DNA sequence: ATTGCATAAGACAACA
DNA sequence: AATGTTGTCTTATGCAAT
DNA sequence: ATTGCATAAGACAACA
DNA sequence: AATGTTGTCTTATGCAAT
């Protein structure tokens, strides 16, 4: 868990998806800090597919300070080189897939493939997805994997990048700092401001403040 | 002049009558200056809705446990009341293990039939593994009350107290002041069950058993005057059963069955 | 129903140690009540009959054999206290102990099939004996046997579900109390009453309502 | 036929209504057959006579003690109410030592005057040596209540709860939610004593102070209808004071002053 | 009448160390003296004193004191304005602002040593008995006479009598006419026992049957 | 004119741009309160392109509630009309040219065309965009209108993207705007919509709102 | 002591008041402190017999008379007096602590009371021939039927001679085996059945038995 | 006329037994209610002897609120009245030999004579008795009079020295039999006890009613 | 007559 | 040794007006 | 009209 | 998770008789 903020260090790669065929290739941008995703679509490896990718990602999630990559042939191509020269962000090499350069974009590719597969089976497409439902099934996949928190954390990846009542205790006092969530017919549930935990208590055992 | 009253209350927190007398004031200034202090009114309306019940026989049951010193060394008795007809079944064992509850529920099934639900408190052998899997195998619901108030099971607790009353009365009117020999255990058990079940209690015209086997349930009753929480009564509702304590009312269109206190309900026209 | 009963004791080997199997069968309903006994006594019969009375009610007679425990004084004055008229019989006669023998056969078959289907062959666990007893009682009391259109319970108790309150008269404006009315609910101060013909509900004062017949 | 009922109750202990319905019986046989079992009636009349009071100001006082967390580290407050006029004096110390009671009673003397008696519970520095000879040196009576019920001094306990209410309302209406600084201790004490004493409480027309200093006491009042123990009511008696709760009545010849509940008294003709 | 003007000052009493600053409150319509002692001399401590004194005696109308630092300091000023008492200052010891103050100072400085020698305390009463000493001194200074009249200060201040009747109320009569000339004695539930102002005839009459008079 | 809150109101239209031939049939869509503009290309007016565009908008902006659109045979087509119910999104369609609702979308169309122009003749693809450059040029222009400026604002668009009862006050008038969450037999627990504050008001001081 | 009419302690004393008949005779019952004194100015067998017999006439027939080794008390006349009277005699010094000392204390009381009576009449040391019997009889009456000490019963009164209710205790159960000694208006004292210790209890915490 | 009260009125007289000689004279002192007597049998009759006997009797028996004697020069002497003022007892006199308050005195006097004579004939002295056994004869006579009952009377003269309201209950027959006294009354029943068997039984408030 | 009012009557709670 | 109390609240009731 | 009755209404308690 | 209950007692009230 590096302490640097978002928009700092990027990671990029492609993937081959015969489900999206004949548009069989995809790529996703991920950040070592926020782990947010931006997706494109293509059917061949070109120096301009990465350019579509970079434009889409920098538009969706702002600009990157630095990008770490692999030794692909078209990454050094003249077109994308002039593009980067205009941009202002540096380009870096590596050994293609070690533990320092490629951080999490590989697992991002795997997770995207399995998520698109599970969505395709949810709406009923086993073998491959046609060139129409591509955008829809994608959009559902990104929305589920970014707009919702995944795993466990104090803040969602997008964040990264009850009236008060007094309850009784067996001692017999009236503790303060409880908010009722659901008000049943003769029962109740209370969440404490500090400990943010819910406990169920009857109605004849609760009285509020003020 | 209500400002002498304002300063006086804010600095001194006086009852409304002394404020009215101490500054030559009257109804309104007194009342709605005395509410303005939040400390003068903190508790004084505690919500209390009080209503467990089942509608027809073998719909909802209840369960608790009993320590009866006269029944040593088998003092642990389970209790089970059928809320619709108030019939009682009680069994005897040694410990509060799940197997005792197994046998108790099996005997209660053999006597009364098969219910749908069993409301209760969360005993240690009760939300247990074996008890839950066995109840699932039998195929009836299981609805625990709030974990800590032994009051949502007020019916089984009350029939528990009544059972202890009857059992003690019989035992110490039979010549046994402290405890019971092993011979008269079944005596006291079966005698308590026969006395409570087949003979009416209180003022009602109906026996618990022939309440349980020949029940009376209305399909469309009379109109009544009842609470919506909006603050006071409306009409356009019907009552299904009106016990002495609490009653059940039914809508005319929504067709709800809700248990409300008899305070909430009063006769139509 | 609840006019003549029966009783007997038949050994069950798998029930060790409490292996003596009391039975009680009504005639007009053929219900069955059963409990375990470590060894037959003149107090075990009283215990079993107290249990049977709790489950079914109070009969008007009993027809057991001439066994040692059924004849001893204890049970005699027990039945004298209750009001149940004892009447013994030849230990095996068909004018007496016939349907109780049929119930013995039915119960033994039910216990065998339940024990085998629960995973046991010759020894039911001691903690699981009353479990099988209650299962047998439930199955033989609440379910039809063979070609019976009813179970024992329906014959025994007549489980009709009536829907109208008891017949009651109301103080008519002429001062008389006309019958043919039925209460439905006893609220506060008032008791809603229908008419057996017009089917109209009218809330009436509690002081003016009194039962019919 | 009441003897089927005799056997049925003696062996079975049935309620009277089921006995009446189960043997074709009527009112009498049922009622005085269900008496005959001593177990069917054991508790149901617990005698309750409830009456402490003093008649005129500075006649009878009371005393209790209070733990007030807001007043740390001097949380121990002594309370004293004058039963005739309901005037309250409260003081503050560190321990429950006899010296604290010395100072508290001295201040109460300086404020209200000199009483005749002080009813109470038996505190550890209370029936102690020093307190007893000091009270003898001052020369006033001292009548402890029953040792263990903190109820015979119900007035000081009730005024204790009232004082705690007032003190907490003033404290946490002043911006102090948990406890009080050493500066505002005298604030709270003096405000609590001033609010309660010089301003009326409830509905009564009269202030505690001008009850204590200009009391009204009747010399011969109206006739009433009261108890003897003989079971129900006689007349030929007069009432001295009839409080909201409980009253004092006086004979016409024996000239007794006895405190009896207001249930015990009702108006003549 | 009573409770019209108050007075106050301090008094250095070495006999009560370490609490060596003792404050005195003196009424002038009845001379009902009230005293209290405080270790330091700040605003909050003397305000504590005033609170205790008003608790014992009640709300005055004016308080004539010296020109001291705290008697007119801010805290005291808005505090008294909140209470609603007309503060007044003057020359520190003038025969108008400290007329009865020094008289009661002499009385208290006499009584303190009289009782200290009565219980045998010469140099300094221990820090545990000053409270009871001051309470006894105030009791002997207020409830007991030092003048030469038949009215104690308590007899002057609170106007102590022993009544026999309460407020008069007007009963109405069975024909519908209300009638004064009757006074209430017992508010029994349902029924009031009201006495005829002329013949001392009490009668049990219902609650709504009677109304207050004037 | 400035909205009330993001992800609650939307507005769309149809546009044709000759330089994107053959796929010159866009379907423009902009938010009102948050003013987020997103588009997607196609070459015929149809239900399929409309549903693809709306499903893409769903996850590029947020799950919709009720989108105000224009007249046509595409919004009202059976597939699209039932699609609106499938996603639970409503319709308040207006005149094909209604000024109250579509002046903003038409101005957005003018902005889009002008940006596409300026940036395209910036790179050097003057008249019409070939197949492999359309995606990147659309990305370039939307990029020019994502996170630099919108044209005038100091607060940019995507930088922004119980039963009612009357109560009583000491004033004597019965003010509205209060909804009860939890009820009691001596008071209530009301909450205003605007200030979203919960206060316990006694039952004497309430009356139903209509 | 346990019961009167049991132990008698007769001793003789000298009072200079009744001189020359200055010797005196007095009996004392240790169980009752009752006193008989008969004037006798010559310590003789006849005198002790007469005083003993007048004491029997006054108080009652005893069971034993306790005196010392005075030779006028074990004489054949006195021995046969005791024999025909069917009582017992024990000798002594006297001067035992527990016994034969209350008689000396009573003698001190006698001399003091006769002295105070005489000085109240106007006699200092010598009393006339018509006053000695008067004064001794007055002293007898003053001592006998007027209580001396701190008891509730006079010395002659020191001469010859409920329903069960259950009570609730701290744990809340009701225990039998108690009875009511005294019953006031809101209180009663309850004594146990076996230990017989009396404790006080509120009237509300007691309920009858059977 | 005996229901006034014990230790209240005392009657005294001089009867001369033929046996106490040569210390012949004798004074008596009796109580009407208690029937308790005590004597000394002096050898002289005079006001001093009168008061010696009187103040022995008051020591023996109790404190009367009045002591009565017949009028004469043997009871009105001024030293006697000084003794009276020393005790403060009211006094009155009557005819010497009337039936107002002396018939019982002379009856008791003849009783004393007969008891003394039978005791003397028991001992062995027929007419006179030595000056050493007079006291013992008096002792036996006094004990026989006081401690034991005279005649059929159940009440001994000792028993007349220092000695719940009646209620009637309902039986199933409804008989309002007497003989019950409440001990700890209640508002639903009573705690009555019989006057002879003295057994406690709580009976309903709806079955008891007052006796007179 | 119906709604609202001005008061009286009754119910709950808690203080080591 | 030597006993519940009463401020605060709720509901019901009757007068007064409309 | 007064006493007694036959019933209805309300109050208390305790169940780990 | 998921809410007091009700037999027994007391008092008040109204009918019925005398
Ligand atoms: C662990 C299993 N368990 C949990 C606890 C131990 N518990 C269980 C009980 O049966 C009871 C019980 O009956 N009561 C009596 C009671 C009190 C007040 C009422 F309103 C009602 Cl109706 C009943 N109380 C408790 C209790 O815990 N604290 C009062 C209790 C029980 O078995
Ligand atoms: C040792 C000194 N001492 C003895 C005990 C500790 N105690 C003393 C208290 O003041 C109280 C007290 O106030 N209350 C409260 C209370 C409870 C029920 C009532 F009815 C009322 Cl009139 C008051 N209870 C107790 C108590 O012991 N057990 C409940 C108590 C006390 O100071
Ligand atoms: Mg329980
Ligand atoms: Mg339980
Ligand atoms: Mg206390
Ligand atoms: Mg205390
Ligand atoms: Zn306030
Ligand atoms: Zn019984």
What's the rounded Cα separation, in Å, for the pair H182 and A155?
Answer: 82
**Partner-chain contact B149 A210, CB within 8 Å:** no
B60 CB below 7 A from strand L atoms: no
Task: Please enumerate in sequence order all residues whose Cβ is within 8 A of that of H143, keeping only pairs 6 or more positions apart, or say none.
Answer: G56, G57, G60, G61
What's the CA angle centered on A128, arms A126 and A133, to 5 degrees?
100
What's the rounded Cα separation, in Å, for the pair D257 and H208?
Answer: 29
The nucleotide lying nearest B150 (C-alpha to C1') is K15
Nearest protein CA to atom 8 of ligand 2, as residue: D150
Would you say C101 is a known binding-site residue?
yes
Q: Domain check: are D201 and D232 in the same one?
A: no
Min distance G187 CA to chain D CA atoms (Å): 8
168-207 in chain G: CB under 8 A from chain H: 180, 183, 188
Q: Domain check: are D205 and D88 in the same one?
A: yes
What's the rounded Cα separation, in Å, for the pair B29 and G29?
Answer: 86
Q: Is H154 exposed, middle or buried (0-12, 13-18, 19+ CB in 10 A)?
A: exposed
Distances in Å between the Cα of H104 and the Cα atoms of B26, F1, H101 are 87, 132, 7
Q: What is the resolution of this structure in A?
A: 3.2
DSSP-based three-state secondary structure for F15: strand
Full strand arrangement of the beta sheet holding C32-37: C8-11, C20-25, C32-37
Side-chain-side CA neighbours of residue E172 (13 Å): 11
B76 CB below 7 A from strand K atoms: no
Q: Looking at residue D143, which CATH number applies to its domain? A: 3.30.420.10
What's the rounded Cα separation, in Å, for the pair G173 and B161?
Answer: 15
Q: Which domain holds residue B245?
A: 223-267
Cis peptide before B73 (omega within 30 of 0): yes
Nearest to D49 among G200, G203, G210 (CB): G203
Task: Please enumerate in sequence order all residues whose Cβ is within 8 A of that of B243, keeping only pairs 6 or more positions apart, or say none.
Answer: B53, B262
Which DSSP symbol is given to C182?
E
Task: Please enumerate in sequence order all residues whose Cβ is within 8 A of that of D58, keeping only pairs 6 or more positions apart, or say none.
Answer: D82, D84, D112, D113, D114, D115, D116
Domains recognised in chain H with CATH numbers = 9-162 (3.30.420.10), 166-210 (2.30.30.10)
What's the rounded Cα separation, in Å, for the pair B197 and H61?
Answer: 75
Which DSSP symbol is given to B73?
T
Give exposure, E83-100, as e/b (b: 16+ Cβ within 10 Å): bebeeeeeeeeeeebbeb
What's the rounded Cα separation, in Å, for the pair F190 and B35?
Answer: 17
Min distance G206 CA to chain D CA atoms (Å): 6
Task: Please enumerate in sequence order all residues whose Cβ is within 8 A of that of G21, keeping only pairs 6 or more positions apart, or say none.
Answer: G39, G40, G41, G42, G132
Asked if G183 has any chain D CB less than 8 Å from its own CB, the reply is: no
Q: Are E21 and E44 in contact (CB under 8 A)?
A: no
Give me the residues paired with residue B238 across strands.
B223, B250
Q: Domain check: are B188 and B246 in the same one?
A: no
Full strand arrangement of the beta sheet holding G187-192: G178-183, G187-192, G198-202
Residue carrying the six token digits 């010399």: D219
Q: Domain check: are D129 and D227 in the same one?
A: no
D257 CB below 7 A from strand I atoms: no
Whether B50 is in a domain gets the answer no
Ligand positioned closest to the Cα atom of B148:
1
Residue spans of alpha helices (H) in chain D: 3-12, 16-22, 27-34, 98-112, 129-138, 154-172, 185-198, 208-212
Whether D10 is in a domain gets the answer no
Q: Domain check: are B258 and B145 in the same one?
A: no
Out of B171, B190, B213, a domain closes at: B213
Full strand arrangement of the beta sheet holding E202-206: E182-187, E191-196, E202-206
Out of B170, B187, B213, a domain closes at: B213
Q: Do chains F and D touch (3 or more CB pairs under 8 A)?
A: no
The total of structural domains in chain D comes to 2
Task: Please enumerate in sequence order all residues whose Cβ is within 8 A of that of D84, keeping only pairs 6 or more positions apart, or say none.
Answer: D54, D55, D56, D57, D58, D59, D60, D211, D212, D215
Ligand 2, pocket-test mutation among D95, D150, D156, D158, most atoms within 8 A of CB: D150
Q: Which residues of D touch G167 (CB under 8 A)?
A: none
List strand I contacts in D 93-112 (CB < 7 A): 96
DSSP string, G119-155: HHHT-SS---TTTHHHHHHHHHHHHHSS--SS-SS-T
Q: Is the CB of D65 under 6 A from ligand 2?
A: yes
Experimental method reported for this structure: cryo-EM
E strands in chain H? 9-13, 28-31, 66-69, 166-169, 180-182, 189-193, 200-204, 208-210
**Partner-chain contact F186 B229, CB within 8 Å:** no
Give the DSSP H or E segment for E152.
none
Q: Domain check: are D118 and D203 in the same one?
A: yes
DSSP-based three-state secondary structure for H15: coil
Calculate how far, in angstroms, residue D26's C-alpha sits from the geometric centre of ligand 8: 18
Q: Looking at residue B242, which CATH number applies to its domain? A: 2.30.30.10
What's the rounded Cα separation, in Å, for the pair B186 and C78?
Answer: 14
Whether B24 is in a domain gets the answer no
Q: Are B158 and B65 in contact (CB under 8 A)?
A: no
Q: Domain check: are D80 and D169 in the same one?
A: yes
DSSP string, G68-111: ---TTTSSHHHHHHHHHHT--EE---S--SSSSSHHHHHHHHHH
Whether D46 is in a domain gets the answer no
Give me the residues paired with residue F37 across strands.
F30
Q: Are G54 and G37 in contact (CB under 8 A)?
A: no
Q: Domain check: are B201 and B124 in the same one?
A: yes
Q: Are D68 and D91 in contact (CB under 8 A)?
A: no
Q: Are E180 and E213 in contact (CB under 8 A)?
A: yes
Nearest protein CA to atom 27 of ligand 2, as residue: D150
Q: Is the CB of D52 under 6 A from ligand 2?
A: no
Whether D64 is in a domain gets the answer yes
Distances in Å between the Cα of G16 and the Cα atoms of B176, E79, G41, G125, G128 are 78, 88, 11, 7, 12
Would you say D7 is a known binding-site residue?
no
Q: Do chains E and F touch (3 or more CB pairs under 8 A)?
A: no
Task: State the helix-helix crossing angle for B185-197 and B154-173, rounded to 10 degrees.
Answer: 120
Q: Domain check: are B105 and B64 in the same one?
A: yes
D168 CB below 7 A from strand I atoms: no
Give exposure, B42-66, as e/b (b: 16+ Cβ within 10 Å): eeebebebbebbbeebbebbbbbbb
Q: Domain check: are D205 and D240 in the same one?
A: no
Where residue D113 falls (left for φ over 0; alpha for ψ -120 to 50; beta otherwise) is: left
C61: tokens are 């007679």
Q: Is H126 exposed, middle or buried (0-12, 13-18, 19+ CB in 10 A)?
A: exposed
Q: Domain check: are B197 and B94 in the same one?
A: yes
DSSP-based three-state secondary structure for A26: strand
Residue (of A17, A104, A32) closest to A65 by Cα position: A32
Out of B194, B213, B232, a domain closes at: B213
Q: Domain check: are D188 and D263 in the same one?
A: no
Whether B240 is in a domain gets the answer yes
User: Phi and psi dihedrals of H90, rounded to 5?
Assistant: -65, 155
Q: Are B91 and B77 in contact (CB under 8 A)?
A: yes
Following CA atoms G187, G191, G192, G193 in sequence, which dihedral angle do they give, to the nearest 10 degrees? -130
User: Phi and psi dihedrals of B259, rounded to 5?
Assistant: -100, 120
């Amino acid at each position: 868990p590096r302490g640097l903020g978002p928009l700092q260090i990027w990671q990029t790669d492609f993937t081959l998806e015969p489900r999206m065929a004949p548009r069989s290739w995809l790529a996703v941008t991920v950040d070592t800090a926020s782990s947010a995703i931006v997706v494109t679509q293509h059917g061949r490896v070109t120096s301009v597919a990465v350019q579509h990718h970079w434009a889409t990602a920098i538009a969706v999630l702002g600009r990157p300070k630095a990008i770490k990559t692999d030794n692909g042939s078209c990454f050094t191509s003249k077109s994308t080189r002039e593009w980067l020269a205009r941009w202002g962000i540096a380009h870096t090499t590596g050994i293609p897939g070690n533990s320092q350069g490629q951080a999490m974009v590989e697992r991002a590719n795997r997770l995207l493939k399995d998520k698109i597969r599970v969505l395709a089976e949810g709406d009923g497409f086993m073998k491959r997805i046609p060139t129409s439902k591509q955008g829809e099934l994608l959009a559902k996949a990104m929305y589920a994997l970014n707009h919702f928190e995944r795993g466990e954390n104090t803040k969602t990846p997008i964040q990264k990048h009850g009236p008060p009542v007094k309850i009784r205790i067996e001692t017999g006092e009236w503790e303060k700092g409880w908010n009722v969530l659901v008000w049943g017919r003769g029962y109740a549930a209370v969440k404490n401001r500090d400990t943010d935990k819910v406990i169920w208590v009857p109605s004849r055992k609760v009285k509020p403040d003020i | 002049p209500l400002r002498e009253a304002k300063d006086l209350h804010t600095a001194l927190h006086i009852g409304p009558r002394a404020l009215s007398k101490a500054c030559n004031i009257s109804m309104q200034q007194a009342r709605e200056v005395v509410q303005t202090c939040p400390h003068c009114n903190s508790a004084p309306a505690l919500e209390a809705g009080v209503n467990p019940r089942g509608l027809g026989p073998l719909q909802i049951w209840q369960t608790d446990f009993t320590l009866e010193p006269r029944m040593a060394p088998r003092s642990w008795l389970a209790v089970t009341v059928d809320t619709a007809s108030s019939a009682i079944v009680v069994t005897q064992h040694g410990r509060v293990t799940s197997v005792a509850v197994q046998h108790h529920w099996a005997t209660a099934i053999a006597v009364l039939g098969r219910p749908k639900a069993i409301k209760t408190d969360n005993g240690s052998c009760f939300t247990s593994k074996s008890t839950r899997e066995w109840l699932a195998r039998w195929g009836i619901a299981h609805t625990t009350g709030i974990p800590g108030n032994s009051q949502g099971q007020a019916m089984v607790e009350r029939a528990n107290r009544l059972l202890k009353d009857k059992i003690r009365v019989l035992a110490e009117g039979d010549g046994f002041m402290k405890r019971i020999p092993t011979s008269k255990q079944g005596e006291l058990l079966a005698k308590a069950m026969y006395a409570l079940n087949h003979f009416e209690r209180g003022e009602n015209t109906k026996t618990p058993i022939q309440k349980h086997w020949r029940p009376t349930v209305l399909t469309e009753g009379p109109p009544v005057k009842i609470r919506i929480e909006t603050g006071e009564w409306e009409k356009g509702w019907n009552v299904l059963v009106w016990g002495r304590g609490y009653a059940a009312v039914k809508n005319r269109d929504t067709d709800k069955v809700i248990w409300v206190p008899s305070r909430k309900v009063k006769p139509d026209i």
